[PDB]
Amino acid sequence: MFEARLVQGSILKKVLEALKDLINEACWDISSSGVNLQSMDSSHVSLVQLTLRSEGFDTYRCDRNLAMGVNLTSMSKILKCAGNEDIITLRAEDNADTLALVFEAPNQEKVSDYEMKLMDLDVEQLGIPEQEYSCVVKMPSGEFARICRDLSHIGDAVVISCAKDGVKFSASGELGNGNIKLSQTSNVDKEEEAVTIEMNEPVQLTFALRYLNFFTKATPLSSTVTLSMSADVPLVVEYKIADMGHLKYYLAPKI
Amino acid sequence: MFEARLVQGSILKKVLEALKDLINEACWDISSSGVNLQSMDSSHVSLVQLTLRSEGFDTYRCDRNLAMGVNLTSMSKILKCAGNEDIITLRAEDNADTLALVFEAPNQEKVSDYEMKLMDLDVEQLGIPEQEYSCVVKMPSGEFARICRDLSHIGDAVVISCAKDGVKFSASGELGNGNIKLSQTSNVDKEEEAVTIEMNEPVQLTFALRYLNFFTKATPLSSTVTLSMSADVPLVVEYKIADMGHLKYYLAPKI
Amino acid sequence: MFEARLVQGSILKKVLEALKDLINEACWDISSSGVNLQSMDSSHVSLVQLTLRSEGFDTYRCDRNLAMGVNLTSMSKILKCAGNEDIITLRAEDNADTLALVFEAPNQEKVSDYEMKLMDLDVEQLGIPEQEYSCVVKMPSGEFARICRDLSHIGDAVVISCAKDGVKFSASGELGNGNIKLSQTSNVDKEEEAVTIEMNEPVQLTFALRYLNFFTKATPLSSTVTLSMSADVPLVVEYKIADMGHLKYYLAPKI
């Protein structure tokens, strides 16, 4: 038996809401150390890596490594039947072709029990080259979402320029161009309002806005986001999942 | 002649919003004891029965029993035009076949006078007698609304199974299957957000989920809903209309 | 050079919201006396005329009259990017391309520099010249908005009847008919409905409700609206924008 009881159900709701548009199907690599997902998106452009560590779960049980192939659109639909404050328990027999999802209200008067059909899929594998990056921008998650959205009216691509004297997002198109300059803070007082740049050398990279606008569906999961960049390698957009792990999205620059 | 004055016109806005999707035209039986509507949907699976007592109105007079044929699409349109806190007055002179509806804004600035056909058409008048039911379930209306909404993502039918210690709703379909068990809870005193059962013998019936989703548009009219059920007879779904009367939806099971 | 600055970002946004569904490509006349926009809408039915005097901006400089051809949907989008508390700067250097729109958030965290390509359109004009009208009605803007919206459920045309009593809007279609009567009560009254009317002779004209429902998108720009009517000429619906300027709509009555 695999069995994982997650007390804050909102978290799994949000993860599915952040993945279902970008990718339709993917295998859930389950083990004693946690749950891990790794997939390309459905247009073969970006890469996604999800991690939810075992200890994040209130109760956790994994007799042996499972791989469950999963339609995320169906999984999301089922999770929309969960409340935000439900305790969600995930359960699969060792080689069973189903995943049960139990949504307990907090007072135990209402209990829901769903049994999802798996789909049978060939796993993907990479993980990408772990790297020391030139720039690391930490910033509010709501601010990053709004920027990508604003600039998507102007252009299909965004140039992210970092230097010592700031970060800048620029886009360009048929109706013109725009530049959004977001200043580092010093003493912001809260921690989650900070804009901090860890800079080694200036960098200027171009990314497809369409894909960044997918990545920002993870905003509910965290109040900050970090962008790690270096020349000619994929951007990582990282959202922390409430002490349990993370959702990274990798994207090639143009060129 | 007919005239009924309702100071809390918000109630009548809620009833028409409850009726307009399911039923398109209906007979309005007006008498000195009040308003009684009764109709099948255009597909013959369900029946609605509405009752508004004369004493529920601020003023009421009926000279003359009347069977006004009414287009509920058109009446819901006109009611849209009413303020939330307008006084609503319904009116019919005699050998005129028109229903007038007068909305007087809260601080007598503005009177709106509306009038609609009153197409007296070949119709019905059933009733169907008092039955004794195997189960009667009372529960919060917003909770029944939620279970019908969520299960409609899974299948197009719901098995309702009643038992001493609770009621279950189960559905099955494309993306897998689902059951929601609500427990009898007692409490009472501080609120009736309870789930109570009255069980002479257990019941187990399948119903059309889309119809139950029409019925739940009445959710805003009452904090609770009752479900009376028996083998082979139509389910009743009752909503109380704040000390003026009731709204009952009737649905026959399958097989 | 042209340059204008405003603290009231919001007003600009509301002007574009109120124009952009009626007209696509527009020509802004920028002179030293201010900004002027005059155009038919894209169906050649109604006429719009916007005026924003130079004094209404808290800085204003214009060397040379410019005719800046803009797509109003694209400019509404851009202005959607700005904080409602943002300081806005409009800037152009004289012709081809660049209108620059700069949004500076209140305390210096964020600056947004946009640049809109201008197309070459001729500066229109015609400026149909003023008149004394049989009848001039002034009323709450949100009440005028609500009357057009509601009657649009009954009919496609409204008949405005002005009289010493007050003003009456009446519409008629398939479902039946409706009239709304606002009366002149005296003075010193709490209700915000002091409908006032300056009158030479009762008028009675019909108007397409589709277009009136375009003109009420200006509702946020002012709390009152003034209607000016005579037989055989266009209605004028005027929103005064706070001694900054005005937005006028012209619609001819049905024959």
| Residue C134: alpha-carbon gap to chain centroid | 22
Q: Are B226 and B210 in contact (CB under 8 A)?
A: no
Angle, alpha carbons B166-B223-A82 (nearest 5°): 55
Burial A137-155 (b: 16+ CB within 10 A, else e): bbbbbebbbbbbebbbbbb
Q: How far is CA C130 from CA B80, C126, C234, in A?
A: 38, 12, 12
Q: What's phi and psi for A162, nearest 5 deg?
A: -110, 140
Q: Are A231 and A205 in contact (CB under 8 A)?
A: yes
**E strand or H helix that includes residue C51:** strand C47-53
**Cβ neighbours around C206 below 10 Å, total:** 15
Burial-class residue A48 by CB neighbours within 10 Å (0-12, 13-18, 19+): buried
Burial B95-104 (b: 16+ CB within 10 A, else e): eeeebbbbbb
Amino acid occupying residue B191? E
- Classify C14 as helix, strand or coil: helix
Mutate to test the interface with C, among A144, A153, A154, A175 (most CBs of C within 10 A): A175
Cβ neighbours of residue A29 closer than 8 Å, sequence gap 6 or more: A35, A36, A37, A38, A65, A66, A67, A123
Q: Are B141 and B222 in contact (CB under 8 A)?
A: yes
Express the helix, strand and coil content of chain A in percent, nearest 5 each: 15, 45, 40
Mutate to test the interface with A, among C86, C112, C117, C118 (most CBs of A within 10 A): C112
Give how far C236 is from chain A: nearest CA, Å. Answer: 34
Burial-class residue B14 by CB neighbours within 10 Å (0-12, 13-18, 19+): buried
CA atoms within 13 A on the CB side of B195: 19
Q: Do C113 and A185 touch (CB under 8 A)?
A: no
Q: Which two tokens stand for residue C250?
A: 């012209």
* Number of domains within chain B: 1
**E strand or H helix that includes residue A145:** helix A141-150
Q: Which two tokens stand for residue C240?
A: 């005064």
Dist. CA C111–CA C34, nearest whole Å: 26
Q: Are B169 and B180 in contact (CB under 8 A)?
A: yes
How many helices and strands (H and E) does chain A possess? 4, 18
**For the residues of C132-197, what is the DSSP string, one character each?**
--SEEEEEEHHHHHHHHHHHTTT-SEEEEEE-SSEEEEEEE-SSEEEEEEEE---SS-SSS---EE
Dist. CA C29–CA B229, nearest whole Å: 72
Of B229, B214, B213, nearest in space to B146 by CA = B213
Q: Are A128 and A234 in contact (CB under 8 A)?
A: yes
Give how far A217 is from chain B: nearest CA, Å. Answer: 22
Rg for chain C (alpha carbons), in Å? 20
Q: Are C72 and C16 in contact (CB under 8 A)?
A: yes
Amino acid occupying residue C182? L
Q: What's phi and psi for B155, nearest 5 deg?
A: -140, -170
Beta-bridge partner residues of C69: C27, C119
Dist. CA C221–CA C244, nearest whole Å: 11
Of B2, B40, B13, nearest in space to B242 by CA = B13
Q: Are A154 and A178 in contact (CB under 8 A)?
A: yes
| Residue A147: alpha-carbon gap to chain centroid | 18
Give how far B176 is from chain A: nearest CA, Å. Answer: 5
Q: Which two tokens stand for residue B211?
A: 């119809």
Q: What's phi and psi for B231, nearest 5 deg?
A: -55, 120
Of C245, C248, C253, nearest in space to C236 by CA = C248
Cβ neighbours of residue B3 closer than 8 Å, sequence gap 6 or more: B59, B60, B61, B89, B90, B91, B92
Q: Are B237 and B225 in contact (CB under 8 A)?
A: yes
Cβ neighbours of residue C188 closer than 8 Å, sequence gap 6 or more: none
Give how far B150 is from chain A: nearest CA, Å. Answer: 5
Give how far C146 is from chain B: nearest CA, Å. Answer: 9
Residue B41 carries which DSSP code?
-
Nearest CA in chain B to A101: B178
Dist. CA B208–CA B86, nearest whole Å: 37
Neighbours of chain C (3+ CB pairs under 8 A): A, B
> In chain A, which residues are followed by a C-to-N distance beyond 2.5 Å, i.e. a gap?
none
Neighbours of chain B (3+ CB pairs under 8 A): A, C
Give just the sign of the alpha carbon dihedral C197, C201, C202, C205: negative
CA atoms within 13 A on the CB side of C91: 10
Q: Which two tokens stand for residue B131?
A: 């039955």
**E strand or H helix that includes residue B67:** strand B66-71
Q: Which of B71, B98, B109 sits opposite C193 (nearest CB)?
A: B109
Dist. CA B78–CA A227, nearest whole Å: 54
Dist. CA B125–CA C152, nearest whole Å: 34
Nearest CA in chain B to A71: B175
Q: Are C190 and B89 in contact (CB under 8 A)?
A: no
Dist. CA A113–CA A134, nearest whole Å: 48
Mutate to test the interface with C, among A147, A148, A150, A185 (most CBs of C within 10 A): A150
Q: Which two tokens stand for residue A207?
A: 């990314």
Q: How far is CA C23 from CA A174, B91, C53, C108, in A?
A: 20, 44, 21, 35
Q: Which two tokens stand for residue C27?
A: 């020509």
Q: Which two tokens stand for residue A105?
A: 């209200």
Helices B72-80 and B10-19, packing angle to 10 deg: 140
Q: Are B207 and B158 in contact (CB under 8 A)?
A: yes
Dist. CA A212–CA C203, nearest whole Å: 58
Q: Which of C109, C115, C117 sits opposite A178 (nearest CB)?
A: C115
User: What is the resolution of the experimental data for this entry, in Å?
Assistant: 2.3
- The owner of tokens 């058109």 is B74
Q: Which two tokens stand for residue C104?
A: 């500076």
Q: Which two tokens stand for residue A216?
A: 């920002």
- The owner of tokens 């299909």 is A156
Q: Which two tokens stand for residue B96?
A: 């005129």
Residue C231 carries which DSSP code?
T
Beta-bridge partner residues of C48: C39, C249
Of A136, A124, A137, A131, nearest in space to A36 by CA = A124
Dist. CA A193–CA A176, nearest whole Å: 31
Of A250, A38, A23, nearest in space to A126 by CA = A38
Rg for chain A (alpha carbons), in Å? 20
- The owner of tokens 């009657």 is C151
| Residue B27: alpha-carbon gap to chain centroid | 15
**E strand or H helix that includes residue C226:** strand C224-229
Express the helix, strand and coil content of chain B in percent, nearest 5 each: 20, 45, 35
Instruction: Describe the strand order of the beta sheet including C245-251 as a list of residue ranges.
Output: C66-71, C25-31, C34-40, C47-53, C245-251, C235-241, C224-229, C135-140, C196-199
**For the residues of B5-24, what is the DSSP string, one character each?**
EES-THHHHHHHHHHTTT-S
- Classify A128 as helix, strand or coil: coil
CATH code, domain with A116: 3.70.10.10
Q: Which domain holds residue A39?
A: 1-255
